[PDB]
Chain A
Amino acid sequence: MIVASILILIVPVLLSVAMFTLAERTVMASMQRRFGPQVSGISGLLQPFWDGLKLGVKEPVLPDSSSAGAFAASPMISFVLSQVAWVGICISDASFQGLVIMAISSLAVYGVMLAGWASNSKYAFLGCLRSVALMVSYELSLGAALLSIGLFVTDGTGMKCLNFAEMPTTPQYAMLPLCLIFLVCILAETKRDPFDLPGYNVEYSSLGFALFFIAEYANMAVMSAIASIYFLGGFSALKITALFFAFVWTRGTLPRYRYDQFMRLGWKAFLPLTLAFFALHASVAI
């Protein structure tokens, strides 16, 4: 029954990832006064499936100067971690569920760094360290935000936890600036605009590349569900769609930062703000 529940979870995750990448193309097109994919299937509804099948019959490039095992292992590790994080969202009852998902998302750094070590490109090694530095820098603000969230999460028996079923079903109006910081931290983790300067998958083709992008979009959906649980009073389909629309909307209208600019932002703005909010919420919670 656990294997059945996990496969029944896995099916809409992949279907949703295909529909997310189509919806990103089409919403980005509608903001730019065009159409986006319409030809490939009726209303363009077959475009992600033909992208996946095109990459399926695409030639796998295995460079004969790299280490083949780590090269194969990097997108597998990314994909596996995304699927495991989704299972932790929906098929768990653990006491420290948010800490579990934070631990899983801290493991997601390895696919980037294994891709940087494996492929023998000069600037893949240069960009992997930058991407890892960005993700590493914003993980701390995510953790301090979780500290602020957990100060008010108590179940019926009186025990404090990070269990998702014990979270309240009303929006957390008291933590609006922390919610905004959380959303920009999600944007920084997924390497989206305005942090998309670093790429690391420059040597990958066919289904290894497809695994990289499925992992990226599934991680975006994980973080969207986490933000909707923590701040928006629950996990729902409408909230997932609205937050995804917001992320595409921000990608349509903004330019990106330099490397040192978002490093200064994450180490001089977001971390002191989350720590100061934690101290204020701890003072309130007494």
Chain B
Amino acid sequence: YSSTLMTADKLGPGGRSSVSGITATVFGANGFLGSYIVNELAKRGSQVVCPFRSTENEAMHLKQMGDLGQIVLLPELDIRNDDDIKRAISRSNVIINCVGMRLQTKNWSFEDVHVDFPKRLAKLAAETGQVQRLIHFSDMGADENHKSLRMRTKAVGDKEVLDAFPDATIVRPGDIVGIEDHFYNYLIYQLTLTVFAPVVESGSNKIQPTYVLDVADAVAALLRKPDTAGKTLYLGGPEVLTMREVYDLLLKTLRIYRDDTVHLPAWAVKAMYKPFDSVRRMLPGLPMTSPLATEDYVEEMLRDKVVPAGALGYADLGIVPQKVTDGLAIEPVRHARVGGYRWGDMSAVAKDIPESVRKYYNI
């Protein structure tokens, strides 16, 4: 149980054909973070079971991630049915929950996804007896006294999970950056493609964004260390930034020479977002609706979302988190700049380059 999870059945040096001994069930495996977690587990020789609700075309990318027989795909998942949850975890000694929601729909509310399903999942996990680890994902700004509904339902579900499954680990990362993220992508869709970009108040609320590969490494580091069972970890990058600094960094990176943002009082932003929030129910959910066009985002922007003092973070897992503002994490937003990424004139350094290279590049 302690460190018998990672040692007792480990066969091979740890590549694609090796065996790690982990059978894991990842809920929400076709999502943004879940795909990276499923890739992290399967590449080391673990069997990963992936139930999903969507069409098979949106889950086909998970089939590549592991050797023959080690990626198991279970379509038509209904999380209101306990039989599907029971079948999906029936051979697993690790359960990882990445199921979450950002907007409400006439079929699904925040309590159904953040409260009721994690409680029933923790109960059915404790019923089996062979599940040695339950990794539940919540947010850094989760709080029971939060005006935003999703943060409050997330904290309530964290309490229910720690109640029903006492050794379950609660993971609370900050904003996650990546190619398919929900943080820079919507901010770039707000800087471009709109007449103006509203900023709540002065934009001085602080955040701690983190990289998706560091969170994927954090899950494996949690599975290694037995002490982290039953704890709560906050995952945040090495830099604390305000939203105005994030907007300035995106405007400098995109090479946009016209600041289209406008600072607005919070009541004005809520008055803008109110007509498309009283009609969010009785509707099956519309494409290209931003998760920033809600009052819950406005309430989140009136507070800090950072790692608390004395909390367990990346350093207790042995991980030095990568920088988010520069390097490989900022390379996808550099592709959306005006004109294209491109190299340059490339002629100052081609002086003492050999003969065929300059003609090959037509310099």
Contact = CB atoms under 8 A, between A and B. Distances in A.
A257 B33 CA distance: 54
Contacts of A120: 340
A260 interface: no
A-B complex: 9 closest residue pairs judged by Cβ atoms: A65-B340, A64-B336, A64-B335, A120-B340, A65-B339, A65-B341, A65-B335, A64-B340, A66-B340
A69 to B, nearest CB: 13
Nearest to A65: B340
B55 to A, nearest CB: 12
A164 B340 CA distance: 50
Nearest to B341: A65
Contacts of B340: 64-66, 120
9 contacts: A64-B335, A64-B336, A64-B340, A65-B335, A65-B339, A65-B340, A65-B341, A66-B340, A120-B340
Interface string B326-337: 000000000110
Interface in A106-136: 120
A112 B12 CA distance: 58
A181 to B, nearest CB: 41
Interface residues of B, number: 5
Interface in A58-88: 64-66
Interface of A: 64-66, 120
Nearest to B335: A64
Nearest to A67: B339
Contacts of B336: 64
Contacts of A66: 340
Nearest to B188: A64
Nearest to A120: B340
Contacts of A64: 335-336, 340
B57 to A, nearest CB: 11
A233 to B, nearest CB: 54
Given A64-B335, A65-B339, A120-B340, 6 more contacts: A64-B336, A64-B340, A65-B335, A65-B340, A65-B341, A66-B340
| SS class, residues of chain B in contact with chain A | loop
A120 B340 CA distance: 9
Pick the most buried of A64, A66, A120: most chain B CB atoms within 10 A of its CB: A64
Contacts of B341: 65
A57 B340 CA distance: 28
A66 B341 CA distance: 11
A64 B339 CA distance: 8
B16 to A, nearest CB: 30
Contacts of B339: 65
Interface string B18-59: 000000000000000000000000000000000000000000
Nearest to A64: B336
A214 B196 CA distance: 36
Interface string B216-235: 00000000000000000000
A54 to B, nearest CB: 14
Interface in B322-363: 335-336, 339-341
A64 B340 CA distance: 7
Contacts of A65: 335, 339-341
A114 B341 CA distance: 21
A72 to B, nearest CB: 13
Pick the most buried of B335, B336, B340, B341: most chain A CB atoms within 10 A of its CB: B340
A66 B336 CA distance: 10
A234 B336 CA distance: 54
Interface in B296-345: 335-336, 339-341
Interface string B62-101: 0000000000000000000000000000000000000000
A120 B336 CA distance: 14
A64 B331 CA distance: 13
A234 to B, nearest CB: 50
Nearest to B340: A65
A66 B340 CA distance: 7
Pick the most buried of A65, A66, A120: most chain B CB atoms within 10 A of its CB: A65
B255 to A, nearest CB: 13
A65 B334 CA distance: 11
B288 to A, nearest CB: 12
A65 B341 CA distance: 7
Nearest to B339: A65
A140 to B, nearest CB: 35
A65 B339 CA distance: 5
B349 to A, nearest CB: 23
B100 to A, nearest CB: 25
B181 to A, nearest CB: 16
A66 B337 CA distance: 10
B265 to A, nearest CB: 33
A31 B334 CA distance: 52
A120 B335 CA distance: 13
A64 B337 CA distance: 8
Contacts of B335: 64-65
A60 to B, nearest CB: 12
A120 B339 CA distance: 10
A64 B193 CA distance: 13
Nearest to A63: B340
Nearest to A66: B340
A286 B346 CA distance: 67
A120 to B, nearest CB: 6
A66 B335 CA distance: 11
Interface in B99-156: none
A223 to B, nearest CB: 38
A43 B35 CA distance: 45
B215 to A, nearest CB: 26
A65 B335 CA distance: 7
A65 B336 CA distance: 7
